[PDB]
Structure 1
Amino acid sequence: GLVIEYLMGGAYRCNYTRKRFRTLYHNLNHFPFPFHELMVWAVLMKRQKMALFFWQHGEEAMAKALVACKLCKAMAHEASENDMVDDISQELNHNSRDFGQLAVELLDQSYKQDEQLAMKLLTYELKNWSNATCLQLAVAAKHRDFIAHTCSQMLLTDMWMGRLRMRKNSGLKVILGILLPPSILSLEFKNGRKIYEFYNAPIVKFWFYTLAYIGYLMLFNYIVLVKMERWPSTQEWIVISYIFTLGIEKMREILMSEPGKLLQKVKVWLQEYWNVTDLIAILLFSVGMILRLQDQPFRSDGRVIYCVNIIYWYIRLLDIFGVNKYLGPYVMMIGKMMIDMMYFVIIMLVVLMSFGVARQAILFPNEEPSWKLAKNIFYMPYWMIYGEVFADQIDPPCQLPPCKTGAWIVPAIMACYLLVANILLVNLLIAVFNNTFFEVKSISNQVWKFQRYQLIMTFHERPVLPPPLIIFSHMTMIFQHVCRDYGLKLFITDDELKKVHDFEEQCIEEYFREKDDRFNSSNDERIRVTSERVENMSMRLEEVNEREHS
């Protein structure tokens, strides 16, 4: 039980380590689900045929497949970390892939048979598997091909829409409800309290946060564009309050993380790059504000830090855009193409420096050592490949001052430099982007459809008020400090549980039967069976012909 809790994750709790089983085992019965135990035994002992045999017998087949995939992945990682023979790691990874494919195929069959029962199969609480739905197990196993399935996407859409029924033209109606409160009681709701049901939907929280962020960006632009006085104005105080409350919210999110150790929670929070960049930006804004409330030079330095910091908050609109179906994969494709582009940037930088050093050395042979020498190399050779290729700034005409010795090579060097930079490297980069686009596009689609779950969960967990006035919700949590019906799970009775179990057994039997029928009717199997039967028939007929009494 301890090793299963170690392999699965932080929150998992096996049945062996429960107090009831510990008390039963201290003074030493049977198991209600024997194949649940035997499947885990066969998985932990690295017996794939036995595990595949035990998987198809019993209830909760999809949960067993997902748990087996996670266990095999964890065992492979542990074996690789302990410098094994490296064949054990490959075998365990193949076992994990096989179990993942089994889970995906079972989900496909279940969704193809019935839709509502399939969506009920992915959300009911699993008593025997540490109270975690199939979605949580599939996410913990990083199974991208499971969350990207159509049924999982429909389930995520239903969880995202909250308790509202509108599906044709949404978004605008949510904005109308947020901006005009006397329009909430005009929408259809799934089966006084209507306001609470409206404002707790993830989509309404998302649009509230979006509008607050747009207003904050507007105020930031206003305070940086116009002249700043000795003390902050009202808009500047609103911007400062937004930054401060966002920092408080980040601290609260860190404090309420999954692990139990303070330093362990920080490490798991500093995994997404957005969190690290947000921390850096908030710290830089605090430094700029500290410098801003001082005399004139420090005030100018703080204003310049504001002007630098506005760029990051403008860039962070792509995180808001990532909710859109078409603007998410494009942003991720951009992220991958930057890594593809860095190398050609390096090569072009080499060529640019090569031209610039020679031009500056030839045209200016009487220069004392000053740091402007390091600026003339990069400045104009970089600007000239973007449409500033002006002559007489390069290649000066030299009534006229005397021409420098050898100052005719410069037009010849900037005839090869432009040809290399604008005809060769950029066209090769275009070809590289062109021939590596299909794989990047497919990967981006899969990863975005996977991360939809994290988006929906983090907007289900978040408070209802946007960051500029979220301080009220934090004070409410203080009062509740001294004091999931849906969105994660879906609790059902025993009759519904039995119906779900029967549906799953029917689906898995149909899946195996259809797979066997497909295998038996393939051309290769028909050819093989026909060849064997023809060989046996030829032997028998030769025996008959040899055995004659006349």
Structure 2
Amino acid sequence: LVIEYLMGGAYRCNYTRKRFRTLYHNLNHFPFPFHELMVWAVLMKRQKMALFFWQHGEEAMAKALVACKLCKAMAHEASENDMVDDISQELNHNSRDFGQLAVELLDQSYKQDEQLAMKLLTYELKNWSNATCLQLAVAAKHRDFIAHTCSQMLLTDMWMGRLRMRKNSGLKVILGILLPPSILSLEFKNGRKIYEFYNAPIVKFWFYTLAYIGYLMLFNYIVLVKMERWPSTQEWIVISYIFTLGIEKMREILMSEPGKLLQKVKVWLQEYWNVTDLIAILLFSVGMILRLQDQPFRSDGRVIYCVNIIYWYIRLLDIFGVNKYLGPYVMMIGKMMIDMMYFVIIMLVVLMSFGVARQAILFPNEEPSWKLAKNIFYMPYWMIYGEVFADQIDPPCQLPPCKTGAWIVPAIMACYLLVANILLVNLLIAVFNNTFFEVKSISNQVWKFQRYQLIMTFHERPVLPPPLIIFSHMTMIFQHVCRDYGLKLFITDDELKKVHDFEEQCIEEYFREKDDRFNSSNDERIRVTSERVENMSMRLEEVNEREHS
């Protein structure tokens, strides 16, 4: 029970199975003893014993990943119940050590044989609640494991589905999705070719992208062109798209992993795209409600549409995030935005000061009105972006008399422009420049980690795009009254034994290489030479002092 609580919601340890429950309720040996000994050493926080038990037996990498997850969960539980706060550091160090061991073992296995390395990451683990190494590594939030070359190659092979399209893809997928006769000219891995072509994640992604582009074009057409009292066909298509997308979001929030409905919404509202999509759908619904009414309400609904189109235009960054070079740039923008806000507060302060000074100096006969609130922000803000217009600030003053102190406005403006356009923007450039390498590397690692989540969330979605997704939901109603690949890879006993022997060979070679590399370092050689020289000097002094003559 405590193992199942530590691991996750979907995990099911062998102890709580009904076979072991019936075998224990009337109170035999274990097939793999070192699994239970390793779990015992991990739970009771005995690091040396756990490291000794790790290198004996089979399924070494799965054991390392399970140990890393258990240590991370134990550290999280320890730094919650007001503990001594030093147990958490030791548990985190143990988790990091186990993760590093898993990464090094994967590196050795990939270096020795590539196909067997990819084989080792996919086969179903019978002793570990029917999970793969990828699922354990993802559930442990191990960014250095997914970002490895072998994991990325495996993710690419799962993303491409049964097709190959190795040298040049993308265009062929679009041709297939637009020209169904062109499907037959594509090679497949070892009537049925249509089903295997359309069930790949990548063709689902391109179908969804084409549907989104079409919906966006319809939205642009319906907001650009004059609208009548009742909606046109393009507006009906847009409304249908929004409604079906909302239905799909509800279906996703209902079929989530947690069993509690209140827990499902709380875990769904974690990504910012989900909450922003919910807000946008509610806003579009409000605008559509106000649209089908009299003239002022219709105008307000149209303005709601024109505001809402901005978000759906921005949401193209999610589509762009698939590309290898347009995802890290988006994340880099996401962090530099926080830096920009921190540096824009000061610009706002200086702008407010200059605007209030100029407005107070120039116009001393203004009644209290809200126009004074915009005369401060408007023109001092457009000034710095390339609209420095004389005679609009410090006007020439047949000629009306000059206001008292009107000569000070250009003196203030010169210093304001010098501060805003030469000091703060250059300092912001320096800040963006000197904090780019860390942000780039972190963004690359995070994107390579989230590739797995993208692949799974496209492998789970129905094959039809959101404008046609209603037909797929009707099918799910018919199936309501009624994984060979994509996640795992089942095998026989002989292939399992071959994989086990390969893994034992890999771990043995890894330990032997580590020992041979440690024993040949300069520091070890110097230490051993010093000790032997000291002992030899003592022996030689004893020999010289003790002679028969």
1:30-79 per-position Cα deviation (integer Å, ceiling 9, x unaligned): 11111111111111111111110111111101111111111111111111
How do 1:229-244 and structure 2 match up within 5 A?
229-244=228-243
1:137-171 per-position Cα deviation (integer Å, ceiling 9, x unaligned): 00000000000000000000000000012200100
Aligned-pair CA distance for 1:379 = 0.5
CA distance in 2 between partners of 1:89 and 1:420 (Å):
48
For residue 4 of structure 1, give the secondary structure of its aligned residue in structure 2. helix
CA distance in 2 between partners of 1:165 and 1:390 (Å):
61
Aligned-pair CA distance for 1:519 = 0.2
Aligned-pair CA distance for 1:15 = 0.9
How do 1:365-380 and structure 2 match up within 5 A?
365-380=364-379
CA distance in 1 between partners of 2:81 and 2:13 (Å):
25
Aligned-pair CA distance for 1:281 = 0.4
Which residue of the partner structure matches residue 383 of structure 2?
384
CA distance in 2 between partners of 1:288 and 1:127 (Å):
53
CA distance in 1 between partners of 2:402 and 2:3 (Å):
82
CA distance in 1 between partners of 2:218 and 2:260 (Å):
38
CA distance in 2 between partners of 1:402 and 1:46 (Å):
86
1:404-451 per-position Cα deviation (integer Å, ceiling 9, x unaligned): 111111101111111110111000000000000000000000000000
How do 1:442-453 and structure 2 match up within 5 A?
442-453=441-452
Larger deviation: 81-90 or 528-537? 81-90
Which residue of the partner structure matches residue 479 of structure 1?
478
Which residue of the partner structure matches residue 72 of structure 1?
71
1:226-269 per-position Cα deviation (integer Å, ceiling 9, x unaligned): 00011111111010100011011001111110000001000110
Q: Does 1:409 align with 2:408?
A: yes
Q: Does 1:101 align with 2:100?
A: yes
Aligned-pair CA distance for 1:317 = 0.3
CA distance in 1 between partners of 2:127 and 2:368 (Å):
76
Aligned-pair CA distance for 1:399 = 1.7
CA distance in 2 between partners of 1:6 and 1:345 (Å):
46
* Uncovered stretches (5+) of structure 1, i.e. residues with no partner: none
Q: Does 1:196 align with 2:195?
A: yes
Which residue of the partner structure matches residue 461 of structure 1?
460
Aligned-pair CA distance for 1:494 = 0.6
1:431-472 per-position Cα deviation (integer Å, ceiling 9, x unaligned): 000000000000000000000000000010011011000100
CA distance in 2 between partners of 1:403 and 1:82 (Å):
72
CA distance in 1 between partners of 2:226 and 2:456 (Å):
42
CA distance in 1 between partners of 2:392 and 2:485 (Å):
69
Larger deviation: 76-85 or 451-460? 76-85
Q: What TM-score, normalized by structure 1, do the two folds share? A: 0.99
Aligned-pair CA distance for 1:20 = 1.0
For residue 384 of structure 1, give the secondary structure of its aligned residue in structure 2. helix
Alpha-carbon RMSD across the aligned residues, in angstroms, is 0.6
Aligned-pair CA distance for 1:81 = 1.2
CA distance in 2 between partners of 1:538 and 1:147 (Å):
54
Aligned-pair CA distance for 1:477 = 0.4
1:314-359 per-position Cα deviation (integer Å, ceiling 9, x unaligned): 0000000000000000000000111111111111111111111111
Which residue of the partner structure matches residue 159 of structure 2?
160
Aligned-pair CA distance for 1:83 = 1.9
CA distance in 2 between partners of 1:62 and 1:365 (Å):
78
CA distance in 2 between partners of 1:102 and 1:377 (Å):
61
Aligned-pair CA distance for 1:402 = 1.0
Which residue of the partner structure matches residue 307 of structure 2?
308
CA distance in 2 between partners of 1:166 and 1:410 (Å):
66
CA distance in 2 between partners of 1:166 and 1:348 (Å):
51
CA distance in 2 between partners of 1:84 and 1:365 (Å):
66
CA distance in 2 between partners of 1:235 and 1:488 (Å):
40
How do 1:133-532 and structure 2 match up within 5 A?
133-532=132-531
CA distance in 1 between partners of 2:400 and 2:83 (Å):
76
Moved over 2 A (4+): none
1:383-412 per-position Cα deviation (integer Å, ceiling 9, x unaligned): 101001111111111121111111111101
For residue 503 of structure 1, give the secondary structure of its aligned residue in structure 2. helix
* Uncovered stretches (5+) of structure 2, i.e. residues with no partner: none
CA distance in 2 between partners of 1:163 and 1:528 (Å):
57
CA distance in 1 between partners of 2:376 and 2:8 (Å):
54
For residue 166 of structure 1, give the secondary structure of its aligned residue in structure 2. coil
CA distance in 1 between partners of 2:380 and 2:115 (Å):
64
CA distance in 2 between partners of 1:352 and 1:33 (Å):
72
Between the two proteins, what is the percent identity of the paired residues?
Answer: 100
CA distance in 2 between partners of 1:98 and 1:52 (Å):
10
CA distance in 1 between partners of 2:9 and 2:399 (Å):
79
Q: What TM-score, normalized by structure 2, do the two folds share? A: 0.99
Aligned-pair CA distance for 1:528 = 0.5
CA distance in 2 between partners of 1:76 and 1:18 (Å):
27
Aligned-pair CA distance for 1:549 = 1.4
Aligned-pair CA distance for 1:548 = 1.4
1:156-210 per-position Cα deviation (integer Å, ceiling 9, x unaligned): 0000000012200100000000100001111000000000000000110000000
Larger deviation: 8-17 or 185-194? 8-17
CA distance in 1 between partners of 2:351 and 2:308 (Å):
30
Larger deviation: 516-525 or 15-24? 15-24
For residue 129 of structure 1, give the secondary structure of its aligned residue in structure 2. coil
Aligned-pair CA distance for 1:485 = 0.5
The aligned length equals: 549
Larger deviation: 393-402 or 100-109? 393-402
CA distance in 1 between partners of 2:418 and 2:16 (Å):
71
Larger deviation: 296-305 or 398-407? 398-407
CA distance in 2 between partners of 1:336 and 1:123 (Å):
35
CA distance in 1 between partners of 2:455 and 2:325 (Å):
17
1:284-336 per-position Cα deviation (integer Å, ceiling 9, x unaligned): 00000000000010000000000000000000000000000000000000001
Aligned-pair CA distance for 1:373 = 0.7
